Paper text:
The electron density map at a resolution of 1.9 Å shows the LP06 (CAZ analog) molecule covalently attached to S64, but the oxyimino side chain, past the imine nitrogen, is missing. In contrast to the SM23 (CEF analog) complex in which inhibitor binding caused change in the unit cell parameters, the LP06 (CAZ analog) complex has the same unit cell as apo FOX-4. The R1 side chain rings adopt different conformations in FOX-4. The bulky oxime group, which is missing in the FOX-4 structure, is well resolved in the E. coli AmpC structures with the carboxylate oriented toward its canonical carboxylate binding pocket (N343, R349). The same replacements may account for the disordered oxime side chain of LP06 (CAZ analog), which binds in the same location. It is notable that the cefotaxime-like BATSI shows a slightly lower affinity than LP06 (CAZ analog), suggesting that while the larger oxime side chain of LP06 is disordered, it does contribute somewhat to the overall affinity.
FOX-4 is of interest because it rapidly hydrolyzes cephamycins. In this analysis, the structure of FOX-4 in complex with SM23 and LP06, a ceftazidime mimic, is described.
Author numbering: 7 to 361
Amino acid sequence: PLTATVDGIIQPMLKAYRIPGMAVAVLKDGKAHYFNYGVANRESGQRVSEQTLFEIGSVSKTLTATLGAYAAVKGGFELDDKVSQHAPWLKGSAFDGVTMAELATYSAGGLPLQFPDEVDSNDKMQTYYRSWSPVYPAGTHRQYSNPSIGLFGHLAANSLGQPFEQLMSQTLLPKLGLHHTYIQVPESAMANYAYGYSKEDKPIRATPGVLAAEAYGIKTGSADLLKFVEANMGYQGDAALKSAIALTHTGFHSVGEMTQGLGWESYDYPVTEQVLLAGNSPAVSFQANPVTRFAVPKAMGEQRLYNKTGSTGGFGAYVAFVPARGIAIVMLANRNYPIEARVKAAHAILSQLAE
Ligand code: NA
Ligand SMILES: [Zn+2]
Ligand SMILES: [Zn+2]
Ligand SMILES: [Zn+2]
Ligand SMILES: [Zn+2]
Ligand SMILES: [Zn+2]
């Protein structure tokens, strides 16, 4: 049984981690199912719905990756192009020796998790990339990195002659049928925007930063985010967007049991909880690891679990889907609670959905 299942997993988790609100959406047998808990705003008491806007943090990277793939499919660049081919200001830099695909998959050579301290203007960002010295040879190490995929999204949008935000809001989101998903939440929708809650229980929301839109800037609810997942299960429409989504299901290297694609990370299905936790642990996400290189990028197919974790100061999100079994789960919360718990919860739920 569906509702009691989700409730049984989710609600104890909300109490244990003091999660004020969570929106959950699952895909099964071709239908969306919504389960909503608690409040978007603990002081007003406004209840969470599938239309409540959450910061989804790095789940945004899957949309950025899709935009990037779309630009590639439309001929703005080839994934194997050197980065400086698409960044005149980077010619002569280390990015002469880095591909767009490496940049998208955090394997450029040791770009850090966050921009350094005062790399926080466009002009200082440009100087930063220009003067960057690789820690590792290109394509040998995976180090999860906002600068890395941030630059990828930025240059990809530029290859079509548009700012990232414009290409996302005027082309990609509308073509995916996502009309309630935002990089900047309009006044008209501000009523739906949840508050995040810090470790100290203060209401907070993410602020704009250098390449923040690209790396972790999407606000959306569970309904829209599930629609994006549905497009990843079977999109039939514009051939280009279909081809783009297909590119995000391509694997470029692996780290242990996890295969890195564009935005999505995936596992061989069926996958155990232990393997899913490991692939999403600090061991993989907060340090550089040598990769298992692929002879050529590989279409990963349907017998996979695809996922992405996402966090901001006040928000915690998780998404996972399994195309061959037609199941997916979206979990959006307004507290940045341990990824470990997100993963157990989702695994327990998906396990039941499969059955
Ligand atoms: Na069974
Ligand atoms: Zn239902
Ligand atoms: Zn500054
Ligand atoms: Zn630029
Ligand atoms: Zn629209
Ligand atoms: Zn696919």
